[PDB]
mmCIF file of C-alpha atoms in Angstrom:
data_model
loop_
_atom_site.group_PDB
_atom_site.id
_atom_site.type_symbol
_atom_site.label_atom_id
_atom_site.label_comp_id
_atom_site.label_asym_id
_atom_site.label_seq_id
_atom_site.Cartn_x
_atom_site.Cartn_y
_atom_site.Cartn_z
ATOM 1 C CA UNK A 196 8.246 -17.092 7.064
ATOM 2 C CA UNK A 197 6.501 -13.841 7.607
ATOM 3 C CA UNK A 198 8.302 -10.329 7.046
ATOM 4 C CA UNK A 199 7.300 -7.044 5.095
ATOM 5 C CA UNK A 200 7.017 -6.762 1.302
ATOM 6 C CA UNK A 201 6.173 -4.069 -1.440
ATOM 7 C CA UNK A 202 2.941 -5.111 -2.963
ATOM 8 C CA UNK A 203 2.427 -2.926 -6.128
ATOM 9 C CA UNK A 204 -0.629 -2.417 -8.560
ATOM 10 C CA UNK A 205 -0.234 -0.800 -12.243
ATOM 11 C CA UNK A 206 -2.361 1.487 -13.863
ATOM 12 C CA UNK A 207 -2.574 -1.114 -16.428
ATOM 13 C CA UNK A 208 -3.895 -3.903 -14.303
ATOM 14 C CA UNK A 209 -0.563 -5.693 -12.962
ATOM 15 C CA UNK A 210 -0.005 -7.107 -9.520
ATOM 16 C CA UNK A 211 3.183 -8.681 -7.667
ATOM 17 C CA UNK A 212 4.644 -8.512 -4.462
ATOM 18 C CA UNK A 213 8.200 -8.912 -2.959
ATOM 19 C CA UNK A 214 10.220 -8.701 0.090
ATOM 20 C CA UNK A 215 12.161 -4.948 0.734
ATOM 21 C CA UNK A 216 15.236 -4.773 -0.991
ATOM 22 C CA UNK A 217 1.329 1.471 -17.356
ATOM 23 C CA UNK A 218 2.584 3.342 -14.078
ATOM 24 C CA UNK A 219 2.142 3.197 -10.637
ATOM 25 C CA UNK A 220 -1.170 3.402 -9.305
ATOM 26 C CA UNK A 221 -0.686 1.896 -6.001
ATOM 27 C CA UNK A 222 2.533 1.053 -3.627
ATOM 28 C CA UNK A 223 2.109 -0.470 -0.269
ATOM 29 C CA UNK A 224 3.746 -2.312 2.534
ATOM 30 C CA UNK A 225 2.770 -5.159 4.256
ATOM 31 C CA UNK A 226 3.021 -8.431 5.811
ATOM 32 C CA UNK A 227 3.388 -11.732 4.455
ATOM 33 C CA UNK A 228 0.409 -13.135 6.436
ATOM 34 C CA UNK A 229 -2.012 -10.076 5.997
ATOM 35 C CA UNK A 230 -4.982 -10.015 3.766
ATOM 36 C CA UNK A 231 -6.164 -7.662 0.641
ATOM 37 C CA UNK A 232 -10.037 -7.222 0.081
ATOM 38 C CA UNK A 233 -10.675 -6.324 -3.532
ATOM 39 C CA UNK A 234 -14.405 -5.087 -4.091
ATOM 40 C CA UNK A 235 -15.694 -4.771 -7.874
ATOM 41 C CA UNK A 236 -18.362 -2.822 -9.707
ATOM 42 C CA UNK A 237 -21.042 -5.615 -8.963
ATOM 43 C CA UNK A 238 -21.151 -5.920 -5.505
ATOM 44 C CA UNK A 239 -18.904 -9.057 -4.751
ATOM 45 C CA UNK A 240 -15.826 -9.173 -2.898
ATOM 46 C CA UNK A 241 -12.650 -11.501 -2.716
ATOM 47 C CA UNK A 242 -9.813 -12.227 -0.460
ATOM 48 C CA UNK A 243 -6.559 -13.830 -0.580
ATOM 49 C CA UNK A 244 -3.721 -13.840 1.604
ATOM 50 C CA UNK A 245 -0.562 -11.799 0.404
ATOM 51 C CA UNK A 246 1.530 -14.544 -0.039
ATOM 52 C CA UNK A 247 -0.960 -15.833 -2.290
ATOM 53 C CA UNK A 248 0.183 -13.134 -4.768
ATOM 54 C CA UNK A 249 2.435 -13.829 -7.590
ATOM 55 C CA UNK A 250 6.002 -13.043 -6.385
ATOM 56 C CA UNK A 251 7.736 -11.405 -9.215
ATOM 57 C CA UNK A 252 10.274 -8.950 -7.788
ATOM 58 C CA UNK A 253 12.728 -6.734 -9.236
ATOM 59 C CA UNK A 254 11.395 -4.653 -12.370
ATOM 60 C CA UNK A 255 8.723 -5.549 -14.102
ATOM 61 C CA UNK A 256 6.509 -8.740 -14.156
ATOM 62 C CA UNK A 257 3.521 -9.602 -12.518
ATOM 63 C CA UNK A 258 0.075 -11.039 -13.683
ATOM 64 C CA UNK A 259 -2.773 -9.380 -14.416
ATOM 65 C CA UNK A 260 -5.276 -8.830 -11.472
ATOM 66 C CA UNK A 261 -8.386 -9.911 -13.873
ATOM 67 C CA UNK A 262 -6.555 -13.291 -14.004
ATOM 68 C CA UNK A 263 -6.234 -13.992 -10.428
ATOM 69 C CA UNK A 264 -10.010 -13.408 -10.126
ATOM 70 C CA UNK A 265 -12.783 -15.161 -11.592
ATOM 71 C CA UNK A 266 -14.498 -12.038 -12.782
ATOM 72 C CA UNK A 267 -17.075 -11.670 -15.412
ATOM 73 C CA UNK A 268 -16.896 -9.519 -18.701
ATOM 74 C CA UNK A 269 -17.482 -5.850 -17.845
ATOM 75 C CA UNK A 270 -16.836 -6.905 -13.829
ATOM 76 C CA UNK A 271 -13.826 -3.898 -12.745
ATOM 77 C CA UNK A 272 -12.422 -3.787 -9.284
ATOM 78 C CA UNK A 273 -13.394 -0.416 -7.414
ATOM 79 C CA UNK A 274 -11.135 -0.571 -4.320
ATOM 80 C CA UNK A 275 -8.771 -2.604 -2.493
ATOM 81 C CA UNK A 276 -8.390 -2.481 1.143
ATOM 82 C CA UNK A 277 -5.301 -4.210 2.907
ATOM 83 C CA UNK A 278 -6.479 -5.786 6.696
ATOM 84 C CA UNK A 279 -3.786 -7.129 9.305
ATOM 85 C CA UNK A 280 -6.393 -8.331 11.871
ATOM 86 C CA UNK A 281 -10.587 -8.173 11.842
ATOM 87 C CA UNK A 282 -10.957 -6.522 14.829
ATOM 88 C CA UNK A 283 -14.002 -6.357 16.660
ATOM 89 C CA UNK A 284 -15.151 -2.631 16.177
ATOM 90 C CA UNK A 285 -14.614 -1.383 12.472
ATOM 91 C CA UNK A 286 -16.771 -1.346 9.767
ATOM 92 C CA UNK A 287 -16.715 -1.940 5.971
ATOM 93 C CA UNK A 288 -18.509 1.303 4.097
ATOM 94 C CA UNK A 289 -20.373 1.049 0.759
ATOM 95 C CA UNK A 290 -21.287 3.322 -1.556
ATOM 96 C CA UNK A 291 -23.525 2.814 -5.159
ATOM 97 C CA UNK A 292 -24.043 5.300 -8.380
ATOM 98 C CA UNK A 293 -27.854 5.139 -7.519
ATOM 99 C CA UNK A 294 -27.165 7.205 -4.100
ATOM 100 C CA UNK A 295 -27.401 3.785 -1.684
ATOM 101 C CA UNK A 296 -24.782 3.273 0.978
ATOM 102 C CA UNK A 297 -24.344 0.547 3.764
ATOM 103 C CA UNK A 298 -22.364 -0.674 5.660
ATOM 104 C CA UNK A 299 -21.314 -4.028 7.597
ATOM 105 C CA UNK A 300 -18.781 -5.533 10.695
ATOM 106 C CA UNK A 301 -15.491 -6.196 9.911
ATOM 107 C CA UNK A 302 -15.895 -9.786 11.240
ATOM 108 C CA UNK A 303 -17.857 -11.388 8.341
ATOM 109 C CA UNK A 304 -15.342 -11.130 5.851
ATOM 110 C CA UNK A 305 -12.665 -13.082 8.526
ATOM 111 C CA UNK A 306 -12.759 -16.499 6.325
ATOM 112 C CA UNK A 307 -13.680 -15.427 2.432
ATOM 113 C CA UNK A 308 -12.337 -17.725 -0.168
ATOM 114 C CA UNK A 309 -10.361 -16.339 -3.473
ATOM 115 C CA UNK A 310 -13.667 -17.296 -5.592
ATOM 116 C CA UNK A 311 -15.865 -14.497 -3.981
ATOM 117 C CA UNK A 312 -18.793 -13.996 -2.396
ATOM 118 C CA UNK A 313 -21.811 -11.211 -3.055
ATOM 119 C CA UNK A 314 -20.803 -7.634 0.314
ATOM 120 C CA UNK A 315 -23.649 -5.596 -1.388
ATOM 121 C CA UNK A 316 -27.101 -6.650 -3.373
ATOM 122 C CA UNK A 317 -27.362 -4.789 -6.115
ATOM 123 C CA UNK A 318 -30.454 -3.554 -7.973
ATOM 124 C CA UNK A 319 -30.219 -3.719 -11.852
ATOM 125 C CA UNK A 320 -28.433 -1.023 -13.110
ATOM 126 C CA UNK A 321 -26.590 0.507 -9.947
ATOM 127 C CA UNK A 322 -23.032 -0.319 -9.194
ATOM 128 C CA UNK A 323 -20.777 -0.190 -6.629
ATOM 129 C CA UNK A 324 -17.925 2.715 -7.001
ATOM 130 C CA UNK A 325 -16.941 3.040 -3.432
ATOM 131 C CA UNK A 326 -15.385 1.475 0.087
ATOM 132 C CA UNK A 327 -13.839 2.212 2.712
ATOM 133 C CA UNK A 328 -13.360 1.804 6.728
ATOM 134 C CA UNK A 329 -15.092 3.546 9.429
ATOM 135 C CA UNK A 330 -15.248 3.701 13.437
ATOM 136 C CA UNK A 331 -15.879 5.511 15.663
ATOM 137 C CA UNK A 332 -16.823 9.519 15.148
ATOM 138 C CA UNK A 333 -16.418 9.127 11.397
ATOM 139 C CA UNK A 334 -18.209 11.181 8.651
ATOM 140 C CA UNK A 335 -18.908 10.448 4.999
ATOM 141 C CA UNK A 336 -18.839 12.620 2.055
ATOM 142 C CA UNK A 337 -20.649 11.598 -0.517
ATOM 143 C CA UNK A 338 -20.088 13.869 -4.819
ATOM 144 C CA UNK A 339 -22.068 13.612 -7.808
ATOM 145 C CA UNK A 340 -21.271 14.233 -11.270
ATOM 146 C CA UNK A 341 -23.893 17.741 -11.332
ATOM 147 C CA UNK A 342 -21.668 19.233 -8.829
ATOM 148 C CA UNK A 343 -23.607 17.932 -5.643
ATOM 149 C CA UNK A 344 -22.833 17.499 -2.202
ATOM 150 C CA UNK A 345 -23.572 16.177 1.381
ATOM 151 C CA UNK A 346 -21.978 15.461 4.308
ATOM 152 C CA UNK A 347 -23.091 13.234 7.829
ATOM 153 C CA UNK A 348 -22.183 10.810 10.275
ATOM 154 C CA UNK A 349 -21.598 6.961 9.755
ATOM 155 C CA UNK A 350 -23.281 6.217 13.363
ATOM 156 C CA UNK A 351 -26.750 7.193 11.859
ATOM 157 C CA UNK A 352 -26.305 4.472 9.232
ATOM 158 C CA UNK A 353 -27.334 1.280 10.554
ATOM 159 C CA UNK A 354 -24.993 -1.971 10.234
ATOM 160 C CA UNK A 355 -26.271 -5.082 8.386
ATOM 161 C CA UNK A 356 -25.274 -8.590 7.142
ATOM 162 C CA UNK A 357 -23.255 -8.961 3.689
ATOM 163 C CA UNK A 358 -26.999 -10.233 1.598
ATOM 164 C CA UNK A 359 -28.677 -7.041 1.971
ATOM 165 C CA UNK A 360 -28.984 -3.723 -0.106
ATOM 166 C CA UNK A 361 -28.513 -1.154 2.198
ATOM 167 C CA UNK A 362 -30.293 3.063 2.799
ATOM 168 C CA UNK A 363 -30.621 5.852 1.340
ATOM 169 C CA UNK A 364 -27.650 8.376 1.212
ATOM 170 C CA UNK A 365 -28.171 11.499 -0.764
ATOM 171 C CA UNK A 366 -31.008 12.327 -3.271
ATOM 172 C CA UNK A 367 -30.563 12.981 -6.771
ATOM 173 C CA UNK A 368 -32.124 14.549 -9.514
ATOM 174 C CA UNK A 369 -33.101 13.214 -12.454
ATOM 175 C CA UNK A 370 -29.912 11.658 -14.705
ATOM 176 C CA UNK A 371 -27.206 12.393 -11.883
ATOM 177 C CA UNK A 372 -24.953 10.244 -10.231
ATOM 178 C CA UNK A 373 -22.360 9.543 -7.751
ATOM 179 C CA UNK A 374 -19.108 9.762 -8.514
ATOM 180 C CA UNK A 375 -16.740 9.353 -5.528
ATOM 181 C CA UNK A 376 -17.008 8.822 -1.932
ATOM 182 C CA UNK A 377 -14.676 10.617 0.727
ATOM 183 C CA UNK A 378 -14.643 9.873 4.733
ATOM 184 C CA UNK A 379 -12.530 13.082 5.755
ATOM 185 C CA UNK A 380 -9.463 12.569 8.063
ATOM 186 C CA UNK A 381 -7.692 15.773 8.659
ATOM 187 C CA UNK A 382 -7.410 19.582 7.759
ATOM 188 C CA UNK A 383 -6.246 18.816 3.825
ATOM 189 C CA UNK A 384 -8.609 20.548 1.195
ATOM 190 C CA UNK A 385 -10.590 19.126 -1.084
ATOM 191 C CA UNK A 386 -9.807 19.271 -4.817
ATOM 192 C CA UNK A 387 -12.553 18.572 -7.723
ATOM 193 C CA UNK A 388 -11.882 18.585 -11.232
ATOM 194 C CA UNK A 389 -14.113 18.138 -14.776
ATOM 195 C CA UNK A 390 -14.636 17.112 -18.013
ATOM 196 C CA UNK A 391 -13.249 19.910 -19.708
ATOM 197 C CA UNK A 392 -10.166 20.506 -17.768
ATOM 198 C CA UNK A 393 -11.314 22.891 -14.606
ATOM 199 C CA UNK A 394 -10.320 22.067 -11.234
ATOM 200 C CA UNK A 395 -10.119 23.963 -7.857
ATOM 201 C CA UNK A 396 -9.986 23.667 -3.895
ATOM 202 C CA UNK A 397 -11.880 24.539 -1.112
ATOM 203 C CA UNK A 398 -10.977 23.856 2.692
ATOM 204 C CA UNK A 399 -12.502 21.243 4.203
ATOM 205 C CA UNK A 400 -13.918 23.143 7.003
ATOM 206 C CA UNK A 401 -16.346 25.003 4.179
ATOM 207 C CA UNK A 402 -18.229 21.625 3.804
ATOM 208 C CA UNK A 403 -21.735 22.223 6.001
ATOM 209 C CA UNK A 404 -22.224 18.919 7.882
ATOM 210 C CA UNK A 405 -26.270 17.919 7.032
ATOM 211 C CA UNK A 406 -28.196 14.580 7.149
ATOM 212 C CA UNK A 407 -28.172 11.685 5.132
ATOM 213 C CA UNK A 408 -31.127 11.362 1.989
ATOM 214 C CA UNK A 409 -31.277 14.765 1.439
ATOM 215 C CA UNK A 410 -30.691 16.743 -1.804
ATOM 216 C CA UNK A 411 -27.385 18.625 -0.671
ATOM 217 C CA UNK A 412 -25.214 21.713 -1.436
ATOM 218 C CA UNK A 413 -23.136 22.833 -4.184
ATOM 219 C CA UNK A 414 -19.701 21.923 -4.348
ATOM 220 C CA UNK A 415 -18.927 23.246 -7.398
ATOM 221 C CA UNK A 416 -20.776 25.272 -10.748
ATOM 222 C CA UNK A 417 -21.037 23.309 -13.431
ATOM 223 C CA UNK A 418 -21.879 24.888 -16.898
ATOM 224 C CA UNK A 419 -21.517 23.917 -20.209
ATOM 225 C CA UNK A 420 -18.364 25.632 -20.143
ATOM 226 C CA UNK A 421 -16.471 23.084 -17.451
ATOM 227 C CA UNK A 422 -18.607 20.447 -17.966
ATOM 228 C CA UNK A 423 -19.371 17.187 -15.270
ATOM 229 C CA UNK A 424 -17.609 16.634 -12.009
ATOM 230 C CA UNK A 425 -14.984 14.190 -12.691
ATOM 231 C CA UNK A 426 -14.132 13.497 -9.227
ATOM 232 C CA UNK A 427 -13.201 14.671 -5.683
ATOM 233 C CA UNK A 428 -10.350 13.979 -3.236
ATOM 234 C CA UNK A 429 -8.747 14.819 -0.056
ATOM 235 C CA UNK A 430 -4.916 15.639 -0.112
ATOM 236 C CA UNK A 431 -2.243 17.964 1.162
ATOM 237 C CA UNK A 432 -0.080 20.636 0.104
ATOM 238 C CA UNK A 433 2.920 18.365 -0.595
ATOM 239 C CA UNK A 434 0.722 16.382 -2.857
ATOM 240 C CA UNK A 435 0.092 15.974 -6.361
ATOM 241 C CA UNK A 436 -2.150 15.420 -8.460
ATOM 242 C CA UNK A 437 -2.618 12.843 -11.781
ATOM 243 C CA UNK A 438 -5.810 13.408 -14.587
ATOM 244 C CA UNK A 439 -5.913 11.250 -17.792
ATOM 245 C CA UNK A 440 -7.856 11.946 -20.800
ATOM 246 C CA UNK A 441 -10.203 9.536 -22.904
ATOM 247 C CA UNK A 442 -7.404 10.417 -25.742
ATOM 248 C CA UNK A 443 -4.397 9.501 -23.523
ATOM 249 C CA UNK A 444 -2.772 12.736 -22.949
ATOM 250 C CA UNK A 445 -1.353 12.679 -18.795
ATOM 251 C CA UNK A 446 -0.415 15.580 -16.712
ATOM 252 C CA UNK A 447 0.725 15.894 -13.137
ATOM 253 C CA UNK A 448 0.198 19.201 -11.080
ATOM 254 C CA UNK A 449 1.366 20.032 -7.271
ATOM 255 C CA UNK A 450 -1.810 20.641 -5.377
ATOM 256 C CA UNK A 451 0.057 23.975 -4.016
ATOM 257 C CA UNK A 452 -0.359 25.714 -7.255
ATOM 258 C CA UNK A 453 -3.950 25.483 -7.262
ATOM 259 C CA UNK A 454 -6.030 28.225 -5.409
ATOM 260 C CA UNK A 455 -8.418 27.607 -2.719
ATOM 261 C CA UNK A 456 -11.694 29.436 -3.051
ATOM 262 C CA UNK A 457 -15.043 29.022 -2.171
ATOM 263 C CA UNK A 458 -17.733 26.274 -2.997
ATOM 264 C CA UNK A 459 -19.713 28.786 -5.409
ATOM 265 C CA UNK A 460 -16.391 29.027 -8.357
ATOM 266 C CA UNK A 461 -15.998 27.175 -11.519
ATOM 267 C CA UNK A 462 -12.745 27.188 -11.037
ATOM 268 C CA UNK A 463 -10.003 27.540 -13.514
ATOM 269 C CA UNK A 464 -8.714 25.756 -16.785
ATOM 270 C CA UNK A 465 -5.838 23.018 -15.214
ATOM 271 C CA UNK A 466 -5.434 21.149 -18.734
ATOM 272 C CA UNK A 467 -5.911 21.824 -22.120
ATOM 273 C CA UNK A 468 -8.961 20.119 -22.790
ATOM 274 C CA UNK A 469 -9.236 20.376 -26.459
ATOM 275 C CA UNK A 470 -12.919 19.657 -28.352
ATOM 276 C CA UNK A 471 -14.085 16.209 -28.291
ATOM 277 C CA UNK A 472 -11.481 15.044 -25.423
ATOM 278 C CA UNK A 473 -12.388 14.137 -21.701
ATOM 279 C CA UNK A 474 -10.976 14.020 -18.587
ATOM 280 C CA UNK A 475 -12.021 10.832 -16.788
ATOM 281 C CA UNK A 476 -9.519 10.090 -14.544
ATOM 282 C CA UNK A 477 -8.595 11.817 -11.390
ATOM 283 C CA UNK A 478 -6.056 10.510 -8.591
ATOM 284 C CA UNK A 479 -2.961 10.966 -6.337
ATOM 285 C CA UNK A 480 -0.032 9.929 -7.367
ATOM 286 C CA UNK A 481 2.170 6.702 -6.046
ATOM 287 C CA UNK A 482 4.308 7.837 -3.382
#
């Protein structure tokens, strides 16, 4: 009974899938019989088969994704990768707060169970806030929140089993952190955005490729006028672009009314911040 469905996640938390016929975070399409990976902030991973799903259809419905998992308290899911086959040369890519990445076959996550199991030991304090896959020629990008940088190659991290911890990635000063992880596919810019409402773009091509565990270039000029680095992603021209506010305020903006400059700018105000409101969300929107 296998044919392709719309399997949609809500900013909110909801889940359900059905055959073709809050707000949207996520809209895919896939087969009955494929598989979704969901990673979370402590390290573990689960699986279930699509069909496995809850099948609500039509508008509205669904169950929360928090009650299909046996998570713990403060436990969030960081990414969710959709897999049709484990072929034999990809990789699953890892990347922690602390600076730590790693990285592991494909093939040991072929026969997980819907209870979990531990993709990345953790030591107390760090988390996990990214994943992805990788092959081949790929590079990684790794961002932190002082308006850090560094780019390299996944071949000179080395692969290892799903109980480890995993290298060092990029070195950070003293109360920094990582904030998003990017493995560049393409000639679309790359947009960062902060507390206080700044944003701005910068080709991709301006991004100096380096070595891994080093302390990296600037990416952007923080002050206490922008404030932190909220996050960083990859898109393109027909784009746009979602940031959300601790106070709830939302606003969209198409990525080709936003100036590229260089790496050395502080960019310009994007969103009325107004005093004691962050931004701290920063995303493409569902297409």
């Amino acid at each position: 009974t296998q044919e392709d469905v719309v399997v949609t996640l809500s900013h909110q938390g909801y889940v359900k899938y059905q055959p073709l016929s809050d707000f949207i975070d996520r809209l895919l399409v896939a087969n009955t019989h494929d598989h979704i990976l969901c990673f979370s902030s402590r390290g573990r991973v689960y699986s279930m088969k699509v069909y496995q799903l809850p099948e609500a259809t039509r508008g509205a419905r669904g169950r929360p994704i928090v009650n299909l998992l046996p998570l713990e308290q403060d436990e969030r899911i960081t990414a969710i990768l959709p897999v049709t086959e484990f072929e034999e040369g990809v990789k699953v890519f890892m990347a922690t707060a602390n600076g730590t990445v790693k990285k592991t076959v494909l093939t040991e996550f072929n026969r997980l169970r819907t209870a979990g199991k531990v993709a990345i030991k953790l030591v107390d304090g760090d988390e996990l806030i990214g994943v992805d896959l990788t092959s081949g020629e790929d590079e990684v990008m790794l961002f932190s929140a002082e308006g850090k940088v560094v780019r390299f190659k996944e071949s000179s991290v080395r692969a290892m089993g799903c109980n480890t911890t995993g290298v060092r990635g990029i070195r950070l000063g003293e109360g920094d952190k990582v904030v998003s992880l990017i493995v560049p596919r393409g000639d679309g810019a790359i947009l960062t955005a902060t507390q206080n409402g700044y944003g701005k773009r910068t080709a991709v091509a301006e991004y100096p490729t380096k070595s891994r565990a080093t302390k990296g270039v600037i990416s952007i000029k923080v002050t206490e006028r922008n404030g932190l680095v909220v996050g960083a992603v990859q898109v393109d021209d027909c784009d746009q672009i979602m940031m959300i506010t601790d106070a709830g305020t939302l606003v969209r903006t198409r990525v080709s009314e936003i100036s590229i400059v260089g790496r050395n700018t502080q960019g310009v105000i994007l969103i009325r911040t107004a005093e004691d409101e962050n931004v701290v969300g920063l995303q493409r929107v569902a297409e």
